[PDB]
Design a protein around this ligand. Structure first.
Ligand SMILES: O=C(O)CCCCN(CCc1ccccc1OCc1ccc(CCc2ccccc2)cc1)Cc1ccc(C(=O)O)cc1
Length: 182
């Protein structure tokens, strides 16, 4: 993924657990060679996976737990590192934000040609609920989506419940979430 993702992981871990832990996690992933991540440079996804994998081992938490937390961090981090207005441009509510997400990524992609954005499809079951279909070129990031959604709830001062109803790992086509929200 683009380096901003890896920069955000670094930032999250460094801030919550200190530099020495991050330096240890960086070493285990086998990325001691990389002196800093370049935010607008495309990396192999394995770099992200290896950082999550190594942080799971070093912190003694599951990777998925870390994905949830990172998903929550991402929404705040990007608002502060040059993406606040773009985020604002996608709306003042969770359902609106999700409807706008495919277009928000179209904007990013002009800038960044190797972007592999996920596809989202909303189906509004009420004015307080929706089912969300999540489709991706990447495997195992559903837990991050769960965090992202909870990041958005926090951003819009909204109570959000998210449950995954279908997983790519029970054989299903794509991930599907059920969402209820204030
Ligand atoms: O892949 C999967 O399954 C999904 C993994 C989730 C990754 N994630 C989900 C976005 C998202 C989802 C839900 C809610 C809020 C969200 O945040 C909105 C938002 C804000 C800011 C930016 C700046 C991007 C940028 C990238 C590079 C340079 C500058 C700017 C992007 C998006 C974004 C992402 C997608 C593809 C790539 C890539 O392909 O690398 C890298 C990152």
């Amino acid at each position: 993924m683009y380096g901003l993702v890896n920069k955000a992981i670094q930032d999250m871990i460094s801030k919550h657990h200190g530099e020495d832990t991050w330096e240890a996690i960086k070493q285990k992933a086998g990325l001691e060679d990389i002196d800093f991540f370049v935010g607008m440079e495309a990396y192999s996804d394995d770099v992200t996976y290896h950082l999550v994998g190594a942080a799971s081992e070093v912190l003694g938490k599951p990777a998925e737990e870390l994905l949830i937390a990172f998903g929550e961090y991402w929404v705040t981090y990007t608002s502060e590192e040059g993406y606040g207005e773009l985020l604002a441009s996608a709306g003042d509510s969770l359902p609106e934000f999700m409807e706008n997400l495919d277009n928000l990524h179209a904007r990013v992609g002009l800038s960044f040609p190797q972007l592999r954005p996920p596809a989202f499809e909303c189906q509004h079951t009420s004015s307080k609920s929706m089912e969300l279909h999540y489709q991706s070129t990447r495997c195992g990031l559903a837990p991050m989506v769960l965090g992202l959604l909870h990041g958005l709830g926090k951003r819009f001062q909204t109570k959000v419940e998210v449950t995954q109803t279908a997983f790519r790992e029970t054989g299903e086509d794509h991930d599907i979430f059920s969402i209820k929200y204030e």
